[PDB]
Design an enzyme around this catalytic site. Structure first.
Site, PDB file in Angstrom:
ATOM      1  N   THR A  36       4.838   2.627  10.333  1.00  0.00           N
ATOM      2  CA  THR A  36       3.999   2.060   9.282  1.00  0.00           C
ATOM      3  C   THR A  36       4.123   2.824   7.969  1.00  0.00           C
ATOM      4  OG1 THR A  36       1.979   3.315   9.834  1.00  0.00           O
ATOM      5  CG2 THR A  36       2.371   1.257  11.036  1.00  0.00           C
ATOM      6  N   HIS A  61      -4.905   7.498  10.346  1.00  0.00           N
ATOM      7  CA  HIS A  61      -5.058   6.737   9.110  1.00  0.00           C
ATOM      8  C   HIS A  61      -6.522   6.402   8.865  1.00  0.00           C
ATOM      9  CE1 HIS A  61      -0.674   6.166   8.842  1.00  0.00           C
ATOM     10  NE2 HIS A  61      -0.664   5.710  10.081  1.00  0.00           N
ATOM     11  N   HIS A  91      -1.330  11.538  14.573  1.00  0.00           N
ATOM     12  CA  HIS A  91      -1.933  11.587  13.254  1.00  0.00           C
ATOM     13  C   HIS A  91      -2.879  10.415  13.146  1.00  0.00           C
ATOM     14  CE1 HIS A  91       1.458   8.807  12.962  1.00  0.00           C
ATOM     15  NE2 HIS A  91       0.662   8.134  12.148  1.00  0.00           N
ATOM     16  N   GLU A 121      -4.989   0.463  10.419  1.00  0.00           N
ATOM     17  CA  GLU A 121      -3.804  -0.277  10.003  1.00  0.00           C
ATOM     18  C   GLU A 121      -3.792  -1.594  10.766  1.00  0.00           C
ATOM     19  OE1 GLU A 121      -0.489   2.672  10.255  1.00  0.00           O
ATOM     20  OE2 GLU A 121      -0.850   2.682   8.091  1.00  0.00           O
ATOM     21  N   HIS A 139       0.736  12.726   3.314  1.00  0.00           N
ATOM     22  CA  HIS A 139       0.289  11.345   3.639  1.00  0.00           C
ATOM     23  C   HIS A 139      -0.697  11.245   4.786  1.00  0.00           C
ATOM     24  CE1 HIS A 139       4.508  11.523   5.078  1.00  0.00           C
ATOM     25  NE2 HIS A 139       4.090  10.912   6.164  1.00  0.00           N
ATOM     26  N   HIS A 156      -2.683   7.470  15.928  1.00  0.00           N
ATOM     27  CA  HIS A 156      -1.350   7.113  16.396  1.00  0.00           C
ATOM     28  C   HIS A 156      -0.720   8.277  17.143  1.00  0.00           C
ATOM     29  CE1 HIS A 156      -0.811   3.875  13.037  1.00  0.00           C
ATOM     30  NE2 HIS A 156      -1.517   3.435  14.063  1.00  0.00           N
TER      31      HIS A 156
HETATM   32 ZN   LIG Z   1       0.574   6.150  11.805  1.00  0.00          ZN
END
Ligand SMILES: [Zn+2]
Length: 258
Positions: A196, A94, A92, A104, A62, A117
């Protein structure tokens, strides 16, 4: 079979396995800058990463996590809206398939190209597993990424991605300094939220920096070469691994700046 970011398993499907997806303090959210209230009681954030010990970088299907040794007090987040001491366990990102999306959290509905994050857990709970079961178990520092000039401190991360292209792949990643990923200013917005990604536990104190960092198009392009799939399975580019904004409900976003 499982959750992901596709048409059939994406964020709008998560509630079936994870009912808290429709809960009262879900993340991310849209930060309405005009409605966020300055809180002069908020302290300066304290980011102490001088002794940070990165260990490994992992594609988990992911996103990719840069993991740190959190068996001692070495990279910690303190102050700000936080009581106590939070230890860095991993960071990590996104990101999107296009520069116009990927973050996000949003700012006045604006979506950034990506969002970093840095996940920390409250030392009073002994470990990450126990911390996520508490309402003040985690502190996640969110930093927006915009496309423009390259971020020198991010290059070491980007050059290793070719070695962890597919799900389940990991690579030694020692001596990485996360300080190279921080913007100049530590001005932030803060609110109570959740992870999240599933399990979407409502254990996070979110601290989102106002100032984005700039990364180059070439750097983000390399993020987009990663795969959601495992080796030897149909290539599915790891892009748009972001959850959209969730209802703010009964929450107030506070600003550390005027
Ligand atoms: Zn995250």
């Amino acid at each position: 079979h499982h959750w992901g970011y596709g048409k059939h398993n994406g964020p709008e499907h998560w509630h079936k396995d994870f009912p808290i997806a429709k809960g009262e303090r879900q993340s991310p959210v849209d930060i309405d800058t005009h409605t966020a209230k300055y809180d002069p009681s908020l302290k300066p954030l304290s980011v102490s990463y001088d002794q940070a010990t990165s260990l490994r970088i992992l594609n988990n299907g992911h996103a990719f996590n840069v993991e740190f040794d959190d068996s001692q007090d070495k990279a910690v987040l303190k102050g700000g809206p936080l009581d106590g001491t939070y230890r860095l366990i991993q960071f990590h990102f996104h990101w999107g398939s296009l520069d116009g999306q990927g973050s996000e959290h949003t700012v006045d509905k604006k979506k950034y190209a990506a969002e970093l994050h840095l996940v920390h857990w409250n030392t009073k709970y002994g470990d990450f597993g126990k911390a996520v079961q508490q309402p003040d178990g985690l502190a996640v520092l969110g930093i927006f990424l915009k496309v423009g000039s390259a971020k020198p401190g991010l290059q070491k991360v980007v050059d290793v991605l070719d070695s962890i292209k597919t799900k389940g792949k990991s690579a030694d990643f020692t001596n990485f300094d996360p300080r190279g990923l921080l913007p100049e200013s530590l001005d932030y917005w803060t609110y109570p939220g959740s992870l999240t990604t599933p399990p979407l536990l409502e254990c996070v104190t979110w601290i989102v920096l106002k100032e984005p960092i700039s990364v180059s198009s070439e750097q983000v392009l390399k993020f987009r070469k990663l795969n959601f799939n495992g080796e030897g399975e149909p290539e599915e580019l790891m892009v748009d691994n972001w959850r959209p904004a969730q209802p703010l409900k009964n929450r107030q976003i506070k600003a550390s700046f005027k």
